[PDB]
Design a protein around this ligand. Structure first.
Ligand SMILES: [Mn+3]
Ligand SMILES: [Mn+3]
Ligand SMILES: [Mn+3]
Ligand SMILES: [Mn+3]
Ligand SMILES: [Mn+3]
Ligand SMILES: [Mn+3]
Ligand SMILES: [Mn+3]
Ligand SMILES: [Mn+3]
Ligand SMILES: [Mn+3]
Ligand SMILES: [Mn+3]
Ligand SMILES: [Mn+3]
Ligand SMILES: [Mn+3]
Ligand SMILES: [O]
Ligand SMILES: [O]
Ligand SMILES: [O]
Ligand SMILES: [O]
Ligand SMILES: [O]
Ligand SMILES: [O]
Ligand SMILES: [O]
Ligand SMILES: [O]
Ligand SMILES: [O]
Ligand SMILES: [O]
Ligand SMILES: [O]
Ligand SMILES: [O]
Ligand SMILES: [O]
Ligand SMILES: [O]
Ligand SMILES: [O]
Ligand SMILES: [O]
Ligand SMILES: [O]
Ligand SMILES: [O]
Lengths: 299, 300, 300, 299, 299, 300
């Protein structure tokens, strides 16, 4: 079972302007083959399907816990996309939009028209080409070593996509999110590498980083490393998955320092609200009446 | 952000027999168009994409919270499929399996060969025809009324699929899960109906049940209604989403009794472990050495 | 614009037995790559997209008219599938079905479980592997000769699929439909062949039949040829598409006799009603109340 | 069975210039999830699969007849797309196009290159992202109330897509078509709402409009309402489906006026011919010889 | 079984500048429905599945040999796409690229972002809309006449796509490749047409060309015709498939001259190397160390 | 550019019986996610897309050469499927088949009806659920280390699928092919492991075998190891890719013996011909006339 906390894993800066094509590129990190939907659903199904949950408990705890962190990653990437598509962030009411004045004319010429037609200028479950995420992006073989090898590859392939998207947009909301997730992805790759070392004797973490560029060369990632976040494996559970530290110990591949298990989630930051976009009819064309109904429910 | 508890939402009975084609039908309720992956991902993305999170807070809390419940529903359906596919449930070691003796011969003739080739006799992210779940099963329009109307429909279409699968298998593990999820789906359809009533004045809950058969006629659902679970909207959050009761109030469509918000999750039941299946190499062909490595991690 | 007549293009025999796997194979002829949805949608979009509607009028009339015939072919194939899936054909009410008695147990083991879970034991828009029909099965290049060459191929590939399905089931409902559509497909292949002959001088009709087996060797097709239906290109329009006979003239490839344009549709046969299937909740679990509401609409 | 009339459901204005990206957006209303292919094929298959065709005849007549109207809607949307892609509308012959002069250079940079490579600058069976229409967009459950609830939702979701596309293009051919189909979609949603009211007692039409913007605020839709088209359910059959008026009666949700069944189709307008586009080889590179062959067939 | 020669079927000119949208269009000729993956895989599977390999040997030889030529065609189209995407062709090392300077900013706005995110600015197995090539583009019925009729259609449909893409780009690398493949596709269509003539008596080659524009009107194709390449069916095998000349004989549909079987492959041209693209991390962010490792392997 | 030799990479045994559901499972090894189409197309496109073809020549030669071997692997798997589907292997003519006698009746109930409807009882480009192979199964990142890590994983995942299919069928044609390809896949995984060792210093070959079962425990694989085929990396090129031995050197992970580069392809075995199947119209309903036309081409 799961619980939800109404906070993003980090504070994101507010967007300054809409950037549809940047949002279309960041979609690769949500619903593309190596996006956060893929890391999430791989680890989630592997955790359900895991055989030997007590006999191999440290490895089960690792996969089950990292799966839970990835729920917050899809949330963070979606918030970033929604920030890049928000017309009036934090504003509950915009008046005077006339459909006959062609208020979505700009959207005719952007890469991803579905953001504006199918979504209400919001994230969709797709990648950078409009390809919808699909369940064949999940690998759940039941064999522990094979699944772990897959997962090590998955995290470094996902890092490669993150780096390429970082190089396509200078938007600060996108770059803050990518910088943070580069650091978290390094933790995941190191954790799966340490798991493989323990089972096979092969020094998988010595292969990192892939590609051969250090996270410290990305300014936003370096800030999170200076805060220690490459050391931290957070235990996203009230009482379970306590044997993480049997695998998550020893040196960080980033800088040789000792890694730690943090009990509990980070404090994080506020959730994002894109505000009213009348031309998208979101949350309504004119939501004044709905706001009144909601206020009356409290009375 | 999210937290995880290592418990299923209910206790499942232990499986007595492998039933591959029952597992292949139950996959409709996991990764088909109207399966639990669809209810989960619809409400999850709607909750991310929600505009007016404070100004429309009771409606946001509702969607965000039900999305969280659906995480435990994909977990429960996956455990059920895994139970139907398990050869040696709860047994850590089986010895003497020889690949050349054709130990997976039976799987040549079952509907879903992917369960045995791509999976290790385990759940996959697909429906009853092998079709993989896909993101176009999600509807996230940004318009509150339209999304809620979609969600009311989605829950009753999902109920229709659950009832049809229930009629295809008499396996007690599958029927226990379906009975419980019929009750929970009734709660969700009623909640979205009540939300629509509040916003539009249209008495959507008077349309229930769809199809026109009461949950009380399904014995495994009636068992859970007798314990009161059709009245409960659990708040799956330590501190957030506290305004659920502004919508989840009044009469249950099942029996006219007053519905309630429960703080926190249900007690639940234990997670399921399908045990060793050597022919699937799961968790390994012979996992003895891996078990020894894991034990040494504790000693160190 | 289009009009509808509440009749099938032929009378079908009444089904005597449910045959799920026969229905799953006949789906190839509805929603597979070379099924009737493909012939329909190819000619429909080609007719929309046609350039030179007046200057090339005889060719436009041909494509626009055959597209209209294909609407009745998807209808006929769907009726055949529904006949193979019907539990109580023509019976409005079945009583005493209890979901807990596993009334759909047989469907756990059939090839196509979607017919029973997603459909109400009814046709779906898919082929014989459960693959859903898709728009990339349409070819609409805008080039007349290339489109006609495609269409000639499409009809003979579709014929090949029909013959193979015919060889898989001896069900009389399926074989009657296939026999009739073999004759109609021969007309369409001959028509597109004659069109290509007129434009290129290449004697495309001399390539027929493909495969090299005559329709007269299939008893149900021979029945319809004995009534003359291989000679007839029906004009499915009140007043339009009158220049068909500029292409549809001369000898039939079947038997050398002169072909004819018939104004208007054939007489046809009655539409099919699969009746009540309570386990599928179709049209309702117990439709008595709905039948009463419908009767009261007339009294009012 | 079906019959065909060589007329569009309305007269469309002639296009002034090619607008490829507008055509790419309007494709959402043809082959996207909530396009006219979806309303068509949903009602068509529901009508085939309907159980109790005599016992529930008024409801069968409604679905079977609306399915037939939707055939004219795919035709109208295709004509609109073809108008937006037509280089020389109504011109049978253009001479002097040289392939080596790069006459399709502009198409390199448009959103939908398939319109120009796979089609001959013509409509395709796809949506606004190039996604091909697929049969899983059809819902045919066999349960009357569930199918009708789906269909009510389908029409208001489709209306939402129509409105968003309307806001992306000011092209008069697109706006005339959308204005007309907004009115027809309102009729369909009202008809399915009235059907649900009769079966369940739930006042579904009181939920309209969705989104909460009136069709009268869209100028092209208002013109068709002033002509009475929101009142009309046309019976698209010579002799069948005569019990429509048992459901299609009473007040229109738009303005409270009494609705009517019209016997027979509207008069409509002429079909569209995009003319010769030599660079697309459509209907041929130089069609002069083909035109001569066609003329000789008449002799 | 197969053997490989490290040469392209023709020499391609070097690219002058990156042209992403031209590459995105040329993808139609690689992984679209009528691209070279389709001609390749159709003939390959037909050759595997062929019944009567000795009794119908001339027809088997034809299909099996043309399948082998198509392997070189996917190679040539991929090289063309890679040329259009290459930043520093023939340069093994570029230094001084900083990810934080947004070196892939231009890629945010191009049609195909996957070329830069999923690929390392390289070809992918997809068409002009980002649609991935799929196995349902193969037709392998087992019936010889039906498969040959399909294949004749396939080659002329593919020619139509080649011509339309030619008209979208004036890039010399693309036009050289298309000009050559127009000539080779004419050979294939003529060969399948001659095969059908021999089996059915229907004069299929009299239908060529489709569309009705001669290859001689395309300057790059005319050059290859002046070199005689429309006459040549190359036998791509050391010792097998020697009965080609029983079908590939008689007159060319292009100019009436006698066609010939050439024993063995053409000499061709060098393979293409796009060089280092640091922002794509291809072959590495900084490959100096990898180059040193490779040099030491020789010692 | 490429050349073709009309030989399979090994001699296959002749089939004794049609086994449709075995063929449907073996399809996983052809057109599924981890089938031979995926190993082929991954290495083929990586070889096209390779940057630093001279500066990193040994690694280019490796990928370009293994891609060429994989062409013969799709050929071998297709021949195996065709063997399992062949009615009259090696027989050019069968007479007396009447379509109206339902000669494909058995195919109504098998898993993969497409083999008989869309194919002429022949291989298709799909996996074990009927899913068609697709281009997103290819990974071509341009980064050498990342691509090699992918390829090492791909070979061991493919091995896992081969072992599971081996356990589903005892058919000798399928098991001979699988035994040989287990040995060849071990060579490929070892080669990519050695390449990764050279570039990173990580001892990837020490992870093998995955799963933890040795090829020598599969009798048909052991047969080929006894002949030395696990030591051989064949150079499938007349004159190119000569620097393979800079990586393919040192110990075999199977048995510690020294591995070798062999110039040129193996001798191989004959290609397979499924013969005439009249009910599939393959190569024709009655191919006598076609055989006569072919013979006359030689006389002329
Ligand atoms: Mn992550
Ligand atoms: Mn991660
Ligand atoms: Mn649920
Ligand atoms: Mn629910
Ligand atoms: Mn037809
Ligand atoms: Mn036809
Ligand atoms: Mn409509
Ligand atoms: Mn409508
Ligand atoms: Mn080619
Ligand atoms: Mn070719
Ligand atoms: Mn292989
Ligand atoms: Mn391999
Ligand atoms: O991740
Ligand atoms: O991540
Ligand atoms: O991550
Ligand atoms: O759900
Ligand atoms: O559920
Ligand atoms: O649910
Ligand atoms: O057809
Ligand atoms: O047909
Ligand atoms: O047909
Ligand atoms: O519609
Ligand atoms: O519409
Ligand atoms: O509509
Ligand atoms: O080709
Ligand atoms: O080609
Ligand atoms: O070609
Ligand atoms: O492989
Ligand atoms: O392999
Ligand atoms: O392999």
């Amino acid at each position: 079972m799961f619980l939800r906390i109404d906070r993003l894993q980090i504070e994101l800066p507010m967007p300054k302007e809409q950037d549809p094509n940047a949002a279309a590129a960041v979609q690769a990190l949500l619903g593309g083959r190596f996006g956060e939907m893929s890391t999430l659903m791989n680890y989630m199904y592997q955790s359900f399907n895991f055989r030997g949950k007590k006999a191999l408990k440290p490895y089960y705890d690792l996969i089950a816990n990292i799966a839970t962190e990835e729920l917050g990653h899809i949330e963070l990437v979606a918030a970033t996309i929604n920030s890049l598509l928000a017309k009036n962030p934090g504003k509950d009411l915009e008046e005077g939009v006339d459909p006959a004045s062609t208020p979505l004319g700009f959207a005719k010429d952007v890469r991803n028209a579905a953001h504006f037609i199918a979504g209400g200028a919001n994230s969709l479950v797709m990648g950078a080409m409009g390809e919808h995420w699909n369940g064949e992006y999940v690998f759940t073989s039941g064999n522990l070593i094979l699944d772990l090898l897959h997962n090590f590859f998955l995290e470094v392939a996902a890092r490669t996509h993150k780096l390429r998207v970082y190089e396509m947009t200078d938007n600060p909301v996108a770059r803050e999110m990518i910088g943070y997730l580069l650091v978290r992805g390094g933790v995941h790759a190191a954790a799966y590498g340490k798991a493989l070392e323990s089972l096979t004797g092969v020094e998988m973490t010595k292969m990192l980083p892939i590609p051969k560029i250090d996270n410290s060369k990305i300014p936003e990632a370096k800030k999170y490393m200076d805060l220690g976040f490459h050391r931290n494996l957070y235990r996203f559970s009230p009482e379970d998955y306590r044997d993480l530290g049997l695998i998550w110990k020893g040196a960080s591949p980033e800088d040789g320092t000792e890694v730690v298990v943090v009990d509990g989630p980070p404090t994080g930051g506020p959730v994002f609200d894109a505000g009213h976009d009348a031309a998208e009819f979101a949350p309504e064309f004119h939501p004044g009446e709905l706001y009144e109904i909601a206020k009356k429910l409290y009375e």
